Structures are given as C-alpha cells and as structure tokens.
Amino acid sequence: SRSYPCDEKKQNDSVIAECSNRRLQEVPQTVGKYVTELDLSDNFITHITNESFQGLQNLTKINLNHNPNGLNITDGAFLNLKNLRELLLEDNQLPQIPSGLPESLTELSLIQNNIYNITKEGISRLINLKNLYLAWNCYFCEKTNIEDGVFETLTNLELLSLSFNSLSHVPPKLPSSLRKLFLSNTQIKYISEEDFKGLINLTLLDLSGNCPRCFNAPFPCVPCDGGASINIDRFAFQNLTQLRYLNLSSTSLRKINAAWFKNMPHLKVLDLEFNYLVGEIASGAFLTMLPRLEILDLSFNYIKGSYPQHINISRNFSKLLSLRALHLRGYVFQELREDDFQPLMQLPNLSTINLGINFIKQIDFKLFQNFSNLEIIYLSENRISPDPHSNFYHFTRPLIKPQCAAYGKALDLSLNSIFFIGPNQFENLPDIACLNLSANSNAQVLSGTEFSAIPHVKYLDLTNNRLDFDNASALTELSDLEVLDLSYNSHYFTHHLEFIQNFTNLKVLNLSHNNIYTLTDKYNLESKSLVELVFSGNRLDILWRYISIFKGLKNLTRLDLSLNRLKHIPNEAFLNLPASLTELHINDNMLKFFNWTLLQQFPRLELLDLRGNKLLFLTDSLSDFTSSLRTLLLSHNRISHLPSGFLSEVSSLKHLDLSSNLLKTINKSALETKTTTKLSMLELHGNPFECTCDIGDFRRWMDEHLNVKIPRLVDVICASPGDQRGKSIVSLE
Amino acid sequence: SRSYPCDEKKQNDSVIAECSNRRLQEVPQTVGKYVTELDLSDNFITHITNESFQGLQNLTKINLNHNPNVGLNITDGAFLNLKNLRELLLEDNQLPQIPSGLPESLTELSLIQNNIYNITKEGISRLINLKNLYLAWNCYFCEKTNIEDGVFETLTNLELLSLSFNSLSHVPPKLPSSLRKLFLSNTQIKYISEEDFKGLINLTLLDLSGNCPRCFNAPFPCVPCDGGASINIDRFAFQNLTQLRYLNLSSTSLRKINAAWFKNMPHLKVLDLEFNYLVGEIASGAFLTMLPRLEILDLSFNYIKGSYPQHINISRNFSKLLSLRALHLRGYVFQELREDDFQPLMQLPNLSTINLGINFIKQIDFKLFQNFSNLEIIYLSENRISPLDPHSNFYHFTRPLIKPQCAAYGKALDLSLNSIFFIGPNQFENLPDIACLNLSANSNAQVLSGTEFSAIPHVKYLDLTNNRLDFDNASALTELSDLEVLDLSYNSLEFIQNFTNLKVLNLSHNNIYTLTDKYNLESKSLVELVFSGNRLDILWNDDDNRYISIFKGLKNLTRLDLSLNRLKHIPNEAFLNLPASLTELHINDNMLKFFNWTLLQQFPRLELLDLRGNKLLFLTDSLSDFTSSLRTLLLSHNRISHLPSGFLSEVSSLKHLDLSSNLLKTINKSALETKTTTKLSMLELHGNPFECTCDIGDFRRWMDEHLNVKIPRLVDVICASPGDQRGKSIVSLE
C-alpha cells in the first residue's frame, strides 16, 4: 500500500497527493481515488483529456503549473469533476482559455500563458468564480481582447487580476462584488470617473507600472510619452469608500490630488514609490487626508542630479496619526538634522523608519530619542562615517532579522562607511537592543569601550568586517550580549578568542568563515552559557595544543564543524567535545573514517550530521554506542554496504538518511530487525541500486513496513540492468 | 637532434637551456655540452654530485631553485669541477648548511629561504670573487644566526650582502668596505650604533626595515618591540655613509626622526618611512630641511589609531625638498584636502607624482592641483569623494599607480574606488588638462548625456570599468572629442560613431543580449573591439535576424574579441558580415561545435584565428584554398581527433599551429606528407591522448626530418596507451 508516484498525506482530515517535480509524461492513473487535492506541477505532461482525472471525483483542487517543464487541453476535460473548486493552469503555453471548464470552479489561475482573448464562451459560464488570475498573458502582443460584459455575469468575483497585459483601458462592466482589482503594468494612461464607479466593496486597487519610472525592474519598462504620469480623474475614486490598499508605484506622478482621498477614510496602505514626488513630500495637501494610514511608502522618488543637504518633510506629516511604518528609501540627501523629522516625533504608532539607500553622510542620532515609540531604525546603505505572485515595488521581507528585532529597539547601520568605531559613534542613541554593523569594512581593534554608549545590546551583527579581537576585553562592555555574529571576519585570522568567557548570558556565537587556523596563548574556547557555536569555514584540520579546543563550552548543545577540510578527526579530539551536545554537524568535510564507538560519551546526542563526506564503513553494533540518536544524516558519501543489525537495535532512530551513496542492495541480514523500531523515515534516492532478483528481499521489507516512509520514490532508480535502468526500484517483478 | 628534456635557445650568441617545471627526478645528462646557462628550477631533483654537471664545462649560470618542488642533498665539491661558474642559485632547497667546496669563480650566490643557521668561513671565506650574496629567509621565526667573526672580511669584492628575515639581533661586525648594498630587513636589530656602519664609505643602499615593526597585514610574522619601542639608531650611526642614496626605514615604529642622521648624507635619493608613527614629524619635522637631493619620499601608513583629523598637517619645511619627484602619503587618514594644506609642495619643480590613496578623504578642493608646477600623476584611489615573493619590495607599491597606456597620454587623475555614485555638474571643475581619467569601481549609475566631462574635454583614455553607467543617449561621452581608449568592462550603442579618434573600445562583461532601435555598431576609426562576456548567442538567431551585421560598420577594425559569448553556432551570414580588415580574431572559450573554414576566404588580412576552449571536431581538407595569410592558428582544448591530409602542408603562411589538449591519438603518414615547403616554426601537441604503438613511428620520423618545426613542452606530450608507455614522452620510444 505504498503510494506511487505521489506522496499521499492526510492534511486536516483530507488526503492530499503531492506529485510535483517527478518527470511524469502524463497524469498517473495510480493516484488514490480518495484524494481531495492533487499537485502535478513541474512535470512533462503534454495532454489533458476527459479520461485524465477519472475516478477522482472528490478532487477539489488541481495544480498543473509549468507543464511541460505547450499543454493540450481538450474541451470539457475537467467537466466530469463536480467538486472541483480550485484549478491552477499557470505557465502552460495555453493559446486560449480552456473551453468547457466545470461550473463549480471558484479559483482559476491562468497566469503567464498565451491567452489574448477573454471571451464569454470560457468565462461567463463560471458563475461561482471568486478569484480570477489572468496575469502575464498579452505581455510584450498587440492588446488583449476583453469581450464587452465578460465579467458582468460573474456576480461572485472578489478578485480580478489582469496585471502585465496590454490593456490600454480599464475593462468596463465589472461586478460590484469585486474586493481586489489588480491592473499593474497594463498600459493604462487614463483613469476616468466611470472606470471604477460601481465598485463600492473594493478594498484593494493596484494601478502600478502605468507610465513607469524605470529603475532596475525585472520586466520591460517603457515610459509614457514626454514624461507623462498616470492621468487619474479628480472623482475617479469618489465611490471606493472601503479602499484599504492603494498601489500607485511607478506611475511618474509629480502631483497628488488630495480629492482622491476625500471619500477614502479607511486607506491603510499607500504605495507612492518610483515617482517624482519630492515636492509633494515637502508640501503635499494629501497628507491631511490620511488619518487611518498605517503604511506609507515614498521610496525612490529622487530628482536626478539633485543631492540636497537636507530632506524636506512637510509639516502635514503630523496629520498621519495612524502611521506605523514610513519608507523613505532612495530620496538621496546628505544630512539628517534633528529639526528635519519634527513632523514625525509626536506620532504614537510610528515604529518603523526606513531610510535605506539614501547616501546620507551625517545623521544627528540624538533625534531618534525624541520619537514616541521607535522599534526599527533602518539606515543600511548610507555614507555614515566614524516571481509573478510577489510584490514587485515594495520590500516584503523584514528590514531586520526577527531574531534580532525581538530583543528590543533595532538600529541597522550595515553597508555604511564606518571603517572604525569612533568614540562618539553611538552617543545620544536610545536603548538599542539589536545592532547591525555588517559590511562596513571595519578594521577596529576592539578594546572594550566602543559600545559603552549602547551597553544593552543583546544581538550584535558584526558580519563582513576585518575586526581585531586579540584583546580579552573586546565587546565585554555589552554584559547582556546573547547573540554575537562574527561571520566573514577572516582578515584578522596573535590570534585570540579569550573575550568569549567574560559573557554571562552569551548563548549563540557564530565564527563562520573566519579561517581560524591558529590561536595564540590560550588555545581553548571557554564559556558557561554558550548553547550554540558555529565554527564552519574555519581550519580545524590545521588545529587538529588544540585537542580540547571546545571542552570549555560546558553548556553547548549545538555545534557546527562543517567546511573545515577535515580528513580525519583524532579520537581524543572527538572525546573532548562537550558531553552536553544534542546536535552535531560535521557535514561538507573530507572524512574517510568515523569512529562510531566514541558516540558512547555523548548520551544526549539526537542529531549527527555527516553529509558530504567520503565515509565507507558503518559499525555493526550502533545500539551499544548510542541510545538517543534520533536523526542520522549520511547523504553524499561513499557507503556501499549496510551492516547486519544497523536498521534494528537503535530504537531511538526515527530518521536515517542514506541518499546519494553507493548502495547496490540491502540484503536479508541487514534488514532482519529482531526488535521493533520507531524509524518513521528512510531516504534512499540517488543510490546505484542493482535491480536484479537480489533487491526482492528489500522490496518485501518495504511492503511489511509501511510506517517507514521512503520519500522521493521516483528518484530511487535502478542502475542495472539495461531493461531496468532509469526505472524506480518499487516498479519491478 | 631535438633537445630533450630542456628547450635549448641561443640568446645573444650564448645557448641557454630552459629545463624548469618538468618533473625531473635528477639532473639530465642529455643537455648539450655547449650551453652556458642552465635552469633546472621547480623539479624533483634530490641529489647533486660532482658527476651531475660533467662535460658542461662552459656553464656560467646554474639555477636549482625549489628542488624538490613542495631536501636537496649536495655533496662536498659537487660544483668544484665548473671553472667558468659565476652565478649559482640555490633558493628554497631545505639546505641545512652552506655547501662545502663551492667553486672559487662564483660572483653571485643565492641561498634564500633555506635552513642555514651558520655563516661559516669554511664555505664563505674561500669565495673571494663574490659580488652578490643573498642569504635571506634562513633563520626566520635556531635561536639566532651564528655569523663567524670576520666571515665577510675576506670577501673584499662584495657589493651586495642580504641577510634579511634572519634572527640576527646585532649588525655583523667586520663587513668589507666594498659594500654598496646592505639588506637587514626583519632581522630583530633593536639597536644601531656608531660602530655598526663605520667603515662602509661606498654604501649606496641601507635596508633597516621591519626592525621593531608596526604590524599591518604583512604576509610574514610581525612581533613588535617591547613596550611599543622603535629602532634605536645612534646620532652618529650614519656619519660615514656619505654616498647613501637609498634608505629603507619602513615598519620601524619610529616616532621621532633625528635630523643629524642626514647631515653627512647629501646624496639621499630615496627615503622610505612607511608604517611608522610619524604624523607629528610630517607636521614639523626638522629632517625635511636636510634632504635637498631627495627624489622619492614615502610617508605612507603613518596614521594614529582613532585619529581622523579634518585636514592633513604638512610642515612648511616640505618646500625644502627641492628635488622631490614623487610623494607617497597613503594611509595618513584625514577628512579634507584644502588648497592651503598643500601650499609647501606647489613651488617644487620636479614634483610629478602625488599619491594620496587609502586616506578616507571625504572632500578635496580640486582647484589646488592647478597651482602645481608639473603634476603628471594624481592618485586618489580608495577615498570617499562624493558627487560634485622574497625578491620584491614588501613595504612599497612598485607597480605603476596608473597603467602606462593611460599615463602616456598626459596628466592622469585616478578617482577609482571612491563614493561617486553619480557625476555631479561640478565634479571636474577647476581641474588641470586631464588626458587620462580613472573612474573605476565607483558604483556609478549616471545616465550619460554628453555634458558630464565638459570641464576636462581632452581626456584621451577613459577608464569607467566596474560601474553601472547608462549609455542609451547617443550623446554619451561625445563631449570628449579626442577620446582614443574607452574602457567599459563590467558595466552589466549609437554614441560610438560620433568619435573621430576612438581606437580601442572594451565592452567586456556587459551582458549585452539586446540592442534597441539601432542594431549595428558603427565607427570609422575603431581598431580594436573587446566584446567578451556578452550574449552574442541571443543576438545571433534564425528569428531575430536584426543583428546579422552587428560589427560590419567597424570598417577600420583589425582586432576583435568574441570570447565567452556562449556561442554554440555562428550563422554563415553573420561570420561573412565581420570586418574584412580583421587581422586578429578571437572566438575562444565558447561552445562551437562546427566552424566553416570556407568563410575565411573573405578575410585576406586575417593573421591570427583563436578558436581555443571550444568543442570543434572537424577540420577542412584544403585550408590553403581559403587562407593565404593566417600565420597563427590556436585550437587548444577542443575535441579534434583527426588531422586531415594536407593540413600541415599547403598553408605556407602558417608559422604557429596549436593543437594541444585535443583528442589526437596519432598523426598518420598522409596527414604529414607535406608536398610543398613550410615556414611552420612551432607546433604545440601536449595533452593529447597519443596511442604510442608502432603507428606513432611515422610522426616520430617527421620530427627528426623537420627540426625547424619546434615542438614545445616535450615532457608533456605523453603516451596514453599502452600500460608500459603510459606517462612517458612520445619522443622517448623504440
């Protein structure tokens, strides 16, 4: 009863079948007729007929995206599916909308296809449609033919996306039930009062990319004739009273009509990035019309050739009473004065100030104290001295890593020009708990006084610098430091690390890619609180005086020793690792042998990662050395034989990864498990399986042990003989 | 008579034998007894005896450096039989002691980077002819080097003595008065006394660098003196060195310079004071009035940690450096260069080079450079300007600050690696007549309009590499009417035709896959176009037949580089539309499966065809029918498995054929049966899977009958089959 070729999984009392990226030539008839959702994306399927989904009558969702990785769909192929609600047909080279789609459809996605006609024959009959995605069809094409009144009969439509299509005009006769209307990059130069007149339930309106300002967009940018902007009529948004989201990014706007927001009291998110609104930021009457706006983005609105000394912020910015986040990237200015941000200092909700990519030379950091409730001060990329389903115009990822921001106030001074930490670097700064000084080419010799103005930093990111930590007092002024990131500080590597033992609350230390090959005077690393140490990209092969380099880390539960060019680990060096370790990574090394007997001195070890090595042999009695190892990763190794009693005896082993190895077969004695095992997963893909009659004993064990899940069955391929080469080991006599 | 394993060459009426990097287990006895210089460096030679260089009596120079490559056992008097031996190089050989019994004729002995801890009279005092003695990197971080008292005293002809990177502690006593150059860098010499350099009146160079060092990214161990102490030079230590021209005092942790050191030093030409703490000495320094004949002054990397002053403090006494030609002031670390800061340098007549690199300078008043007598190089790289090897000099930048091809045009200004994100309207106002300009690596995203370089319009060589510039406007850079060399490498085209003198254009790694409106490149003067790292595969296709004659407009073109364009196939019409005037064509590092050799008939001046790093299989039968001028054909790293009959013959102009790293198993009788004479002076065949059976005999006979055709790297032309010949050279068979 092992499912092939899909991975069946009961999700929330509904069996779903994952069948993506499996090189399938056609829709398989070996899919369980009890499944509700089927995902056949990224396959080589070229034909869909009325007999493709026969028997699967309980199918509510079908995914056929990127097939073949054109797709020939016959009329009424999906018509037999009465319970079909969601159908995804993205990137299939469809020349027209499939005729004869089931009436039950509520979600239809026909993104990035060759559909140039939106006709009533394939749309008007689908009255249940709530979400219709028709983006990237007639994109760079000679205009999309939208039949007059094609959307009018779809009285249940809540979302209509026609972005990245040559439209020229807003389609007439749109259903009043619309809540989200996406018309980005649709070549719509004019918006009239009649275009969005009957849409009172509209919460989102996307008019971005129409008359665009070109700025490294991953799609063609062709600006309007003579630097013209989008022409929105004064009363074009007088009926959209429920509008919460308005996207006018890249519309070459120079003037903003305040009358657009008179009958828009609920506007929550406004995107005006990639425009020419420097003058509107300085005076703007529209700022007094947004009392409930929480996110305002005015990024990349700079005037070419203009590098002003200060940013001109209108006094009307004090009227944005609900403002939580202000994005002012790419304004391009030289100095941030205390009186420049006066209109923002009394806003109670303002927690995020985004000033990234502004080429600011000086900032009066005392102004940040005068703010009501700032939590994120993003100043990355400044000159301070000592996918069709994504948002294309606005940064969606967090400005600061959530693990850093959770500690408290965050300041991001990364990619700046702080080549050394001056004595006044952090004077007059609020109580900063998260600090990012990444990629500053900082070559500071740390002495223990550089962070005295902000001593409550709990998360310090110093990655991509050339810092000096020879002094045992380095960073010790930060007595509450819990996370220290010193990745990519390989320039410095006397060579000391004695500062680490002074911290009373240091939990995570990352010393990755520091190329540490030598340690002067003190050769050991000590700490009573350190829980995780990342030592990847270093030279442990040269180090192995360093026999007990990590023994001092008594509280250590996680250790990463990957990418250290380790050919062999001395037996004494392995025994000197912290006994408290619960997770050890020694992946991507050159280990020829591994002494499994030494695992007896690690009673809490739950994860042993030995991937990307050159291991050959395995121990006969692993149960005698481990009684806690729950996960063993051994992928990309040279193991050619599984020993007798390896799968058995180790009761704690729940996940064994033997993929990408040299296993030709698994004999009867190797899998003759005398005792019961809670092994819930076994990865075996990428092995050169000799598919002769010898593999039959392993195949029998797969049927007798259905609890042991073997993922990627299509990738567990036979190497020999010629008649079975390429085929899965589960599909044999 | 084909030399093996060395490449014999008569250089200036003297036959020299190059035998380096050839995996030789021992010194070969198959070296011509008529050679004068022998280079056996980078080999696996482990033993040298008196029967190693027998018969080679005319040997004047022997190079045995790096043997074995990654110790060397030399017996006593091994080189004693060589009466004409003058130069002997024994660097990096793990020699535990100086070889006993060296020939008396030796004038140049180099024993660099060895395990020599004793400089004894047994191996040194007998060599009275020695003029140059190099003993560097021997007892480097043995407690101290044991230099026998008076070991150098008998060497009355010694002009150069190098004892750098050795634990010396003290300057060796009894040095010959004939010394002209004394190198004592990184020798742990904390104190210099009056008696240390007393009897050396002919000394022209003195190296005391790295003694009490200031640590700064040095590729060797740096251990500073106790309590931050500097080198202690006595007041009268240099009172007898009247002929001193070169003084290296770099990395000596100096804080004060005694002016009395230069009182009896009127010829001091080069002074090195980089990597010290002389910020205060630069601001007041009494020593500046003692150097009237100094031409090169280096005060780089003398910054005070934590100190970022608003201006550089230059002493008024800098006006006393009347012979100054080059001033190096890198790593001072300051914020502004004002007009009145460099006033003491403005009336010096010889001052042509000002080096202000790595200074973190935020703003410079560029009008001050006009007020200089004769500036030719203004090096401002690695600053914050905004819109509007044991045989090398370790502490000094020996390579040219500006590329000589750029500097030759005239005044050069290097503003690379600065914070100029866009060219402001006042960027170049008040600048001298700049003929060479470097604006590389500035992250410059300027949309060029034809007015950005109006203040400096006589720029002949413009370097704009590693930027993000926009050249859509046909007026871009056209204000520079005398532009001859334009470098736009790594900036990932109607402006090109406006230039009347543009000779070299480099558009490498711009990833040009599409051209809007005008699809062709035109120019009447362009001689060389570098189009590597672009997307010619996308441009050339049976759908968008718009870029079929993309380079036809370049009528004066003689050199074209089309490498790294991912070309799998070149359309026949696209190849025929290339400039007929081409004399050098590079299509290397592509994915070409086929090459239509017939099309070479439309290129009568083509002398070099580079087709390396491709996947070519087939060659034409009658190449002479298509070419009558191809002098060099490079075909290395290809899948060619057969040489056609009459390929080597018929093409009289072919002087260099490169068939190395291919799949040639053999060269049959019909393939090399040359009916007509040839002027083929070179044939590279290494890296081929040569089937060394009796079939290779016909090719071996041709090698003896054609000695004029030189086959380089004979040790690398290795047999693949059979097992008994695998690894051996094809020339060493029955």
Ligand SMILES: *[C@@H]1O[C@H](CO)[C@@H](O[C@@H]2O[C@H](CO)[C@@H](O[C@@H]3O[C@H](CO[C@H]4O[C@H](CO)[C@@H](O)[C@H](O)[C@@H]4O)[C@@H](O)[C@H](O[C@H]4O[C@H](CO)[C@@H](O)[C@H](O)[C@@H]4O)[C@@H]3O)[C@H](O)[C@H]2NC(C)=O)[C@H](O)[C@H]1NC(C)=O
């Ligand atoms: C103009 O500005 C507007 C905003 O003012 C932008 O609108 C947003 O566009 C993006 C991209 O199209 C939308 O993001 C996607 O939303 C989908 C639906 O979200 C709902 O359902 C999920 C649960 O499934 C909830 O968690 C969520 O809160 C919503 O209730 C998601 O399914 C998408 O997620 C998937 O794709 C992304 C990207 O590949 C992955 O990162 C995810 O992990 C996941 O796989 C996605 O998040 C967004 O919802 C729109 N906003 C609104 C309010 O509707 C326009 O895009 C912008 N125009 C341009 C051209 O930039």
Ligand SMILES: *[C@@H]1O[C@H](CO)[C@@H](O[C@@H]2O[C@H](CO)[C@@H](O[C@@H]3O[C@H](CO[C@H]4O[C@H](CO)[C@@H](O)[C@H](O)[C@@H]4O)[C@@H](O)[C@H](O[C@H]4O[C@H](CO)[C@@H](O)[C@H](O)[C@@H]4O)[C@@H]3O)[C@H](O)[C@H]2NC(C)=O)[C@H](O)[C@H]1NC(C)=O
């Ligand atoms: C220097 O070294 C440090 C320490 O290793 C690195 O920082 C850690 O980076 C990892 C990712 O590489 C972080 O781990 C991730 O955390 C995410 C957020 O955690 C929250 O949500 C989870 C639930 O999902 C909670 O359990 C948790 O308590 C938090 O509330 C997780 O969502 C991530 O999970 C995903 O990936 C892992 C595999 O990495 C899978 O096992 C999961 O199933 C899931 O798919 C992930 O765990 C970690 O939090 C960071 N630690 C710190 C202290 O910041 C630095 O990145 C490194 N620096 C450099 C430059 O390399």
Ligand SMILES: *[C@@H]1O[C@H](CO)[C@@H](O[C@@H]2O[C@H](CO)[C@@H](O[C@@H]3O[C@H](CO[C@H]4O[C@H](CO)[C@@H](O)[C@H](O)[C@@H]4O)[C@@H](O)[C@H](O[C@H]4O[C@H](CO)[C@@H](O)[C@H](O)[C@@H]4O)[C@@H]3O)[C@H](O)[C@H]2NC(C)=O)[C@H](O)[C@H]1NC(C)=O
């Ligand atoms: C302290 O400061 C002094 C200067 O006052 C430095 O001295 C120089 O040191 C370098 C390196 O040791 C010397 O450079 C070498 O000179 C050799 C001899 O040069 C003469 O002969 C050649 C012809 O063979 C003439 O062209 C030349 O003008 C001289 O007449 C050269 O043979 C060397 O060249 C070879 O090596 C280099 C480096 O690998 C290659 O680039 C070359 O192509 C070639 O293969 C080399 O140029 C220099 O001569 C010294 N100056 C003086 C005046 O003698 C100290 O080095 C410095 N100390 C420290 C520690 O930095």
Ligand SMILES: *[C@@H]1O[C@H](CO)[C@@H](O[C@@H]2O[C@H](CO)[C@@H](O[C@@H]3O[C@H](CO[C@H]4O[C@H](CO)[C@@H](O)[C@H](O)[C@@H]4O)[C@@H](O)[C@H](O[C@H]4O[C@H](CO)[C@@H](O)[C@H](O)[C@@H]4O)[C@@H]3O)[C@H](O)[C@H]2NC(C)=O)[C@H](O)[C@H]1NC(C)=O
């Ligand atoms: C963008 O593209 C341009 C054009 O290709 C590049 O600039 C050229 O770079 C090459 C090197 O890559 C330069 O060529 C070298 O010039 C040296 C100096 O030339 C003088 O001396 C020679 C005699 O040696 C005279 O014949 C000549 O007329 C000059 O007076 C030569 O010494 C070099 O020769 C050595 O290398 C070549 C192989 O490259 C060997 O064949 C020689 O035997 C010898 O070993 C060499 O020829 C060239 O001068 C540059 N041209 C210009 C206009 O500057 C840019 O570098 C490139 N930009 C980037 C970033 O890649």
Ligand SMILES: *[C@@H]1O[C@H](CO)[C@@H](O[C@@H]2O[C@H](CO)[C@@H](O[C@@H]3O[C@H](CO)[C@@H](O)[C@H](O)[C@@H]3O)[C@H](O)[C@H]2NC(C)=O)[C@H](O)[C@H]1NC(C)=O
């Ligand atoms: C401190 O600031 C630095 C610099 O802004 C932050 O580093 C950046 O982190 C992001 C997210 O981890 C990286 O983005 C991703 O990079 C990968 C790899 O190139 C790319 O494939 C993704 O599309 C995405 O761009 C970004 O590259 C990285 N930049 C650098 C220079 O390292 C860092 O995360 C900040 N730290 C904290 C604590 O917030």
Ligand SMILES: *[C@@H]1O[C@H](CO)[C@@H](O[C@@H]2O[C@H](CO)[C@@H](O[C@@H]3O[C@H](CO)[C@@H](O)[C@H](O)[C@@H]3O)[C@H](O)[C@H]2NC(C)=O)[C@H](O)[C@H]1NC(C)=O
């Ligand atoms: C204009 O300024 C740029 C930036 O300084 C110059 O480029 C630099 O040129 C030098 C010499 O060609 C390069 O140095 C060498 O680079 C190789 C490769 O990394 C390295 O192996 C050598 O040891 C040496 O460092 C240097 O890397 C290169 N830098 C950059 C960023 O390209 C350029 O030559 C100047 N142009 C003119 C006309 O002077």
Ligand SMILES: Cc1cc(N2CCc3c(c(C)nn3C[C@]34CC[C@](NC(=O)[C@@H]5COCCN5)(CC3)CC4)C2)c2cnn(C)c2n1
């Ligand atoms: C007033 C004005 C502004 C201009 N802008 C052009 C460049 C730019 C601007 C903004 C905003 N974004 N961008 C793109 C980029 C951001 C960071 C960068 N650099 C880096 O990321 C690296 C990181 O590492 C240190 C060195 N810089 C890579 C891309 C450098 C420009 C402003 C221009 C252009 N022409 N004229 C006349 C201008 N006039």
Ligand SMILES: Cc1cc(N2CCc3c(c(C)nn3C[C@]34CC[C@](NC(=O)[C@@H]5COCCN5)(CC3)CC4)C2)c2cnn(C)c2n1
């Ligand atoms: C007054 C003062 C000066 C200091 N210095 C340290 C760094 C430094 C200085 C000088 C001179 N040289 N160096 C090295 C380096 C040059 C260019 C660089 N960066 C780059 O090459 C790259 C390339 O272009 C893009 C980004 N920078 C790489 C290496 C950035 C420093 C001055 C220090 C240190 N601690 N304290 C308290 C200081 N106090």
Ligand SMILES: *[C@@H]1O[C@H](CO)[C@@H](O)[C@H](O)[C@H]1NC(C)=O
């Ligand atoms: C669909 O599911 C129901 C239970 O929800 C079941 O009774 C019915 O037989 C299923 N139909 C098919 C075709 O599997």
Ligand SMILES: *[C@@H]1O[C@H](CO)[C@@H](O)[C@H](O)[C@H]1NC(C)=O
């Ligand atoms: C401030 O934010 C809180 C929610 O975090 C919200 O309840 C409150 O109304 C906001 N203040 C204003 C003036 O909008």
Ligand SMILES: *[C@@H]1O[C@H](CO)[C@@H](O)[C@H](O)[C@H]1NC(C)=O
């Ligand atoms: C904070 O800002 C207000 C204006 O909003 C100003 O009156 C006050 O003086 C500022 N406080 C400080 C300490 O500068």
Ligand SMILES: *[C@@H]1O[C@H](CO)[C@@H](O)[C@H](O)[C@H]1NC(C)=O
């Ligand atoms: C090391 O740090 C301590 C504490 O700040 C300081 O006293 C000492 O001078 C520092 N060492 C050096 C050489 O700067």
Ligand SMILES: *[C@@H]1O[C@H](CO)[C@@H](O)[C@H](O)[C@H]1NC(C)=O
């Ligand atoms: C060990 O680590 C845990 C988890 O971070 C922490 O609670 C505990 O205090 C640490 N032990 C000591 C002795 O610091």
Ligand SMILES: *[C@@H]1O[C@H](CO)[C@@H](O)[C@H](O)[C@H]1NC(C)=O
């Ligand atoms: C494993 O380590 C122990 C202790 O160092 C040693 O006695 C034993 O021989 C090692 N076993 C293997 C297989 O190398």
Ligand SMILES: *[C@@H]1O[C@H](CO)[C@@H](O)[C@H](O)[C@H]1NC(C)=O
């Ligand atoms: C050395 O060269 C001379 C000619 O310069 C020649 O007469 C003599 O025979 C040569 N000696 C040897 C051993 O080759």
Ligand SMILES: *[C@@H]1O[C@H](CO)[C@@H](O)[C@H](O)[C@H]1NC(C)=O
């Ligand atoms: C200036 O340089 C020339 C050689 O270029 C030299 O003859 C002249 O004496 C120098 N001037 C001084 C004052 O040294």
